[PDB]
Each structure stands twice: as C-alpha cells, then as structure tokens.
C-alpha cells in the first residue's frame, strides 16, 4: 500500500489526466454547480497534489482521495441557498459522505440545454485557449451525465479535440465539424447509457450480477481464451467499474491503463483481433479493446454434453464450488454463441443453475436433469419471435413512423411515466430498428436485445427518480434478466383516467419553424404521448390522423402570413373544440 494516494495516482495518471479526471469527479456530483468554479477547485487540488508528489510526507499526503478531494467539493456545496438538499453531503465523514454525493446523482439534472454557437465563434474559442476550451466540454458532459465511464470520457475530449484542431484549418469548417460532433453526440449518448447499466448491475445487483454478465461477453469476445484467462479479465474489469461507479475515479482509469496493457502483453492467449489495437495512442487503444470484434471460436469443440449433464461429477462439482461451476458452463455456453444475446446466455446459465438445486437433491440428479438443454429451446426462440415480427414491422414504418408506434404502445401501457421520458425511451428503442434490424437474421439477436437492456434500464433510471407506476417499478427491481419479459407482458391500462387538455401543450410556436427537423419530430411525438394521454381509448386511424394535422399545419404557418400568429389560430382551433364538451 502506498503512502499518499494521491501522489500515487498523480505519478501513475500523469498531470493532463489527473486534472481531467477530478474536474469529471467534481461535475459528476456538483452538476449544478458553474464551471469556473469547479476549475478552480480542481487547479487547488492538482497544487496539493504536486506537494505530496515532491514530499509525501507533507501534512495531509496521507489522507483518502474521497477525504481530500471530498473536503474541496463541498467548499461550493455546503451553499444551500444555492444547491439545496447537497450539504446533506457535506455534513457528514467519509465514507458516509461519498455514499451520500453517489446517491444524489441525477440522471435527469434540471440543467440549461447547450446553446452551440457558430462554428466560427468556436474554432475562435478554440484556438484562445485550447485548454479551457477542452475542460468546458469534459465538464458539460459529466454534469449532464453523471455515470459516463470517465476514462471513456477522456478518449472523447481527446477525439473532439481532434476534431477542431483539423476542423478549424479546414476551407469548409463547417461541412467537415458538423459530422464529427454530430457522431460524437451520438456515440457519447450510447456510451453513457451503456455506462448507467453496468453501474445500476453493481449498485443494484451486485458484484456477482455484473461477473456474470461480464464472464457471457467477455466469452463471446474472447473465445480461444481459457477460463482462467476469462475469469482472470472478469475479475480485473469488475474491479475497474466497481470503482468508477463508486466514484473512485483516479483508481478506475489507473486500474483501467493496467488492464489495457495486460491485454495487449497476452494477446496470444486472448484474441487475434487485438493486433491493430495495442498499437494505438493509450485512450484509442482501450477504447479498441472494449469494442473489439469477437474474435472466431475454436473450431470442432465438443458438447457441454459430457461435462454439465453426463459426467458424475455434475452434483460434485456444483456443490463443491457453485460460482466457478457456473462460471464456466456459462463460459462454454457463450463461447460458442456469439449470436445469442448476453441475457439469454444470463437466462440459461440460470436455469442451468436452478435445475442442478432441484436435481442435486434428488433420488437419482442424473435421470433429473437429462433432459435440461431440451428446456433452452423455448428460451432460445422467444426473443427471436420479437425481433423478427419488430424487424417487420420497422422495415414498412421507417424508424420515426416506428418510433410513433411505440410511443402509442408504450404509452398505454405505463401513462402515469412522465412525458419526456417516454419520448426518449421510445425513440431510443426506435434505434435499436435502425441498428439491427440492419444486420443478417443472424446476428441481429445480440445487438437487439442487449440495447433494448440499456434502454429499458433508462426507462428504469428515468421512472427511480420520482416513481409514479408500481409496475414499472417492480419490473426494474424484479430481476435484471427478466426485465424485458416484464416490461413485454404488460397490459394496457384501463385503470388509468384519462388527462384534461392543456391547451398549450397542443399549441405550437413561430419557433418551431427554426427547429431542426429531428427538435420537430421530438416535439410532435412529445405532443403524440400527451395526445394518448388525454384519450387513451384513442385509435390508430385516429391518432394517426391526427398526426398529420399537426404535420400539414407547421408546414403552412412557417410560410404563411405571420408564422407566429399562424400556431395561435390553430391553437384556438383545437381550444374551441374541448370546451365544446
Ligand atoms: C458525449 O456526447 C454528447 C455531447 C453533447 C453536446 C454537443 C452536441 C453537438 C455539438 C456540440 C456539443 C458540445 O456542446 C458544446 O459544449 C461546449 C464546451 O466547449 C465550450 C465553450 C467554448 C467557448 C464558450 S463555451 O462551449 C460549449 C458549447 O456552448 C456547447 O454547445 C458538447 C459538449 O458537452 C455537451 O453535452 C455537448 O455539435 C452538434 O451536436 C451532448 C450530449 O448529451 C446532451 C452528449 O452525450
């Protein structure tokens, strides 16, 4: 164990990181808090560090990093006429406090949306300072997502960056910036709700929910490897996301470096798809690593056959070390299914499991549990029933007309959830059609339902906050697994009275017609779930029809005669007709 933590990481991290890493620590607990600030108090904490570097036995070298940098947060916390329910933090020690900063986390900050100005006005900033320039983006993405996997994070600053110092030279800046951003806010919010996932397993579900899970992917990726390689993998990335997620940034992207360079120094006995990416710069070659391509399985291997049902130690075994047992059925399953989705390789290690407690307590374990694999088959088909006749369905409705399906569907089902959230969970859900149904009847099952996993769990996140449907919350807390099965087995519902109509929120703005086209899609399938939500009882040749008024009147009043009075009379239009009853 080392003597001042800090300096050890300062020295491990090296400065640039350091500094980057603690400004994400900052935003990701204090996301109200403005960026001057939190720079400053980053700059203070990266003097002390320095100190400790060149005298680690210096006054208070030897503190926990959560006690020192804990003590510098809440110098701008401890306001609550400022940030509120916050210094709730701040009156109490580590460890206590850094639970207390964690559970305050908020996937839905009340936060200013961002401006973003002329690509003039920014390649301007840019050049400046280049360094705040930088921090002002890592510091913007972190408040508004608090679970970004923040050694991820660095790669994306390192790419934007990139992006200005060749875009800001360019003859046409705009036509070369604009797409690289426009792929980075994507990716970004890909990465963060695949990020909130892995933490909610942790957090939630344990470290043994997450191993399992890591062990079924990592088999996939890796499946010339040996289980001891596998499991020695699982177990160094759970170490690294257990500490990201408890906010342990500065041990994380360390812990993180560390394995990426393992990795890289074994590749011979983990995958011969490494090969372009260990000799990348150290951000990009990690990022390689995590979304590296499977790599091909061994070719003949035999069945499972003998060792999970036929061998005489079946019962044995499993009693004589349940978790590896399982560990490795599960990694002999996902090696040689690269096409089944994590949770269904979850679902049938589980039955696995529970089959061997009922049948290891039996007259004879072996005439019980013969038949188990026969008892895959319905849990292999199922998802594969729902992401054809989805894939149908989203290849004549095009994803937005698909989306609106959903909204419709989903709305129904859960109309107490809140507005914006099943606006964003359906459209997200809406690119799972996009993304998948693209690839061959063949690998699509992956890639359908591990995403619809990270957008159900957003749904879930979003509901936890301020929860208002009892079935969305015991399909989150229920299992993980089964998560899916219960959202799909809900029915519409009836119990619900239906909403009053507001006028203004089916009344539009002369701001529309300046909105991008995807901003007027979002705001008319926002106006679509309170459409529902007023009459639920509404049909699809109706709201469909609906649909369309909306369409052909923004249309005609961003030309017509005044395009801001244009809304209104459409607005006392649709005004007139609710006060008619
Ligand atoms: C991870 O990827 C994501 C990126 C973004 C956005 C985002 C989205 C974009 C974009 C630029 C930006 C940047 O926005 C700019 O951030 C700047 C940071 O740099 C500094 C400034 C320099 C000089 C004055 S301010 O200015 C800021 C701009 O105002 C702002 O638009 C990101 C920086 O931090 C964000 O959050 C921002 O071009 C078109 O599409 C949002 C996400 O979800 C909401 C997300 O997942």
């Given at each position: 164990?080392?003597?001042?933590?800090?300096?050890?990481?300062?020295?491990?991290?090296?400065?640039?990181?350091?500094?980057?890493?603690?400004?994400?620590?900052?935003?990701?607990?204090?996301?109200?808090?403005?960026?001057?600030?939190?720079?400053?108090?980053?700059?203070?904490?990266?003097?002390?560090?320095?100190?400790?570097?060149?005298?680690?036995?210096?006054?208070?070298?030897?503190?926990?990093?959560?006690?020192?940098?804990?003590?510098?947060?809440?110098?701008?916390?401890?306001?609550?006429?400022?940030?509120?329910?916050?210094?709730?933090?701040?009156?109490?020690?580590?460890?206590?406090?850094?639970?207390?900063?964690?559970?305050?986390?908020?996937?839905?900050?009340?936060?200013?949306?961002?401006?973003?100005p002329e690509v003039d006005v920014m390649?301007?900033?840019?050049?400046?300072?280049?360094?705040?320039?930088?921090?002002?983006?890592?510091?913007?993405?972190?408040?508004?997502?608090?679970?970004?996997?923040?050694?991820?994070?660095?790669?994306?600053?390192?790419?934007?960056?990139?992006?200005?110092?060749?875009?800001?030279?360019?003859?046409?800046?705009?036509?070369?910036?604009?797409?690289?951003?426009?792929?980075?806010?994507?990716?970004?919010?890909?990465?963060?709700?695949?990020?909130?996932?892995?933490?909610?397993?942790?957090?939630?579900?344990?470290?043994?929910?997450?191993?399992?899970?890591?062990?079924?992917?990592?088999?996939?990726?890796?499946?010339?490897?040996?289980?001891?390689?596998?499991?020695?993998?699982?177990?160094?990335?759970?170490?690294?996301?257990?500490?990201?997620?408890?906010?342990?940034?500065?041990?994380?992207?360390?812990?993180?470096?560390?394995?990426?360079?393992?990795?890289?120094?074994?590749?011979?006995?983990?995958?011969?798809?490494?090969?372009?990416?260990?000799?990348?710069?150290?951000?990009?070659?990690?990022?390689?690593?995590?979304?590296?391509?499977?790599?091909?399985?061994?070719?003949?291997?035999?069945?499972?056959?003998?060792?999970?049902?036929?061998?005489?130690?079946?019962?044995?075994?499993?009693?004589?070390?349940?978790?590896?047992?399982?560990?490795?059925?599960?990694?002999?399953?996902?090696?040689?299914?690269?096409?089944?989705?994590?949770?269904?390789?979850?679902?049938?290690?589980?039955?696995?499991?529970?089959?061997?407690?009922?049948?290891?307590?039996?007259?004879?374990?072996?005439?019980?549990?013969?038949?188990?694999?026969?008892?895959?088959?319905?849990?292999?088909?199922?998802?594969?029933?729902?992401?054809?006749?989805?894939?149908?369905?989203?290849?004549?409705?095009?994803?937005?007309?698909?989306?609106?399906?959903?909204?419709?569907?989903?709305?129904?089902?859960?109309?107490?959830?809140?507005?914006?959230?099943?606006?964003?969970?359906?459209?997200?859900?809406?690119?799972?059609?996009?993304?998948?149904?693209?690839?061959?009847?063949?690998?699509?099952?992956?890639?359908?339902?591990?995403?619809?996993?990270?957008?159900?769990?957003?749904?879930?996140?979003?509901?936890?906050?301020?929860?208002?449907?009892?079935?969305?919350?015991?399909?989150?807390?229920?299992?993980?697994?089964?998560?899916?099965?219960?959202?799909?087995?809900?029915?519409?519902?009836?119990?619900?009275?239906?909403?009053?109509?507001?006028?203004?929120?089916?009344?539009?703005?002369?701001?529309?017609?300046?909105?991008?086209?995807?901003?007027?899609?979002?705001?008319?399938?926002?106006?679509?779930?309170?459409?529902?939500?007023?009459?639920?009882?509404?049909?699809?040749?109706?709201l469909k029809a609906v649909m369309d008024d909306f369409a052909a009147?923004?249309?005609?009043?961003?030309?017509?005669?005044?395009?801001?009075?244009?809304?209104?009379?459409?607005?006392?239009?649709?005004?007139?007709?609710?006060?008619?009853?």
């Amino acid at each position: 164990a080392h003597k001042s933590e800090v300096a050890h990481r300062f020295k491990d991290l090296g400065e640039e990181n350091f500094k980057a890493l603690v400004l994400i620590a900052f935003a990701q607990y204090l996301q109200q808090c403005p960026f001057e600030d939190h720079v400053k108090l980053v700059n203070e904490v990266t003097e002390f560090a320095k100190t400790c570097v060149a005298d680690e036995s210096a006054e208070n070298c030897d503190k926990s990093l959560h006690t020192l940098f804990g003590d510098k947060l809440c110098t701008v916390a401890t306001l609550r006429e400022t940030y509120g329910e916050m210094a709730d933090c701040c009156a109490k020690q580590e460890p206590e406090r850094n639970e207390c900063f964690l559970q305050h986390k908020d996937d839905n900050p009340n936060l200013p949306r961002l401006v973003r100005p002329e690509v003039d006005v920014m390649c301007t900033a840019f050049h400046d300072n280049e360094e705040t320039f930088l921090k002002k983006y890592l510091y913007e993405i972190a408040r508004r997502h608090p679970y970004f996997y923040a050694p991820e994070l660095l790669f994306f600053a390192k790419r934007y960056k990139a992006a200005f110092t060749e875009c800001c030279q360019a003859a046409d800046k705009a036509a070369c910036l604009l797409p690289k951003l426009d792929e980075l806010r994507d990716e970004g919010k890909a990465s963060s709700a695949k990020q909130r996932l892995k933490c909610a397993s942790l957090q939630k579900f344990g470290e043994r929910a997450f191993k399992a899970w890591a062990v079924a992917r990592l088999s996939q990726r890796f499946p010339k490897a040996e289980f001891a390689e596998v499991s020695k993998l699982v177990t160094d990335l759970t170490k690294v996301h257990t500490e990201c997620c408890h906010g342990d940034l500065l041990e994380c992207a360390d812990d993180r470096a560390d394995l990426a360079k393992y990795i890289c120094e074994n590749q011979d006995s983990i995958s011969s798809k490494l090969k372009e990416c260990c000799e990348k710069p150290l951000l990009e070659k990690s990022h390689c690593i995590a979304e590296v391509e499977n790599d091909e399985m061994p070719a003949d291997l035999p069945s499972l056959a003998a060792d999970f049902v036929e061998s005489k130690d079946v019962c044995k075994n499993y009693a004589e070390a349940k978790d590896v047992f399982l560990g490795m059925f599960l990694y002999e399953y996902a090696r040689r299914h690269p096409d089944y989705s994590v949770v269904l390789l979850l679902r049938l290690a589980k039955t696995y499991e529970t089959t061997l407690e009922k049948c290891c307590a039996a007259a004879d374990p072996h005439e019980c549990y013969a038949k188990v694999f026969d008892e895959f088959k319905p849990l292999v088909e199922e998802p594969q029933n729902l992401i054809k006749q989805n894939c149908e369905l989203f290849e004549q409705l095009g994803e937005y007309k698909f989306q609106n399906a959903l909204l419709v569907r989903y709305t129904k089902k859960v109309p107490q959830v809140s507005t914006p959230t099943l606006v964003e969970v359906s459209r997200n859900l809406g690119k799972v059609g996009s993304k998948c149904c693209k690839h061959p009847e063949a690998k699509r099952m992956p890639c359908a339902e591990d995403y619809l996993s990270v957008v159900l769990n957003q749904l879930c996140v979003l509901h936890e906050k301020t929860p208002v449907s009892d079935r969305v919350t015991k399909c989150c807390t229920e299992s993980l697994v089964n998560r899916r099965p219960c959202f799909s087995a809900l029915e519409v519902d009836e119990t619900y009275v239906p909403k009053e109509f507001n006028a203004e929120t089916f009344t539009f703005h002369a701001d529309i017609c300046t909105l991008s086209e995807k901003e007027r899609q979002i705001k008319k399938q926002t106006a679509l779930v309170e459409l529902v939500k007023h009459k639920p009882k509404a049909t699809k040749e109706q709201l469909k029809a609906v649909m369309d008024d909306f369409a052909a009147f923004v249309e005609k009043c961003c030309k017509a005669d005044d395009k801001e009075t244009c809304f209104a009379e459409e607005g006392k239009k649709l005004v007139a007709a609710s006060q008619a009853a």
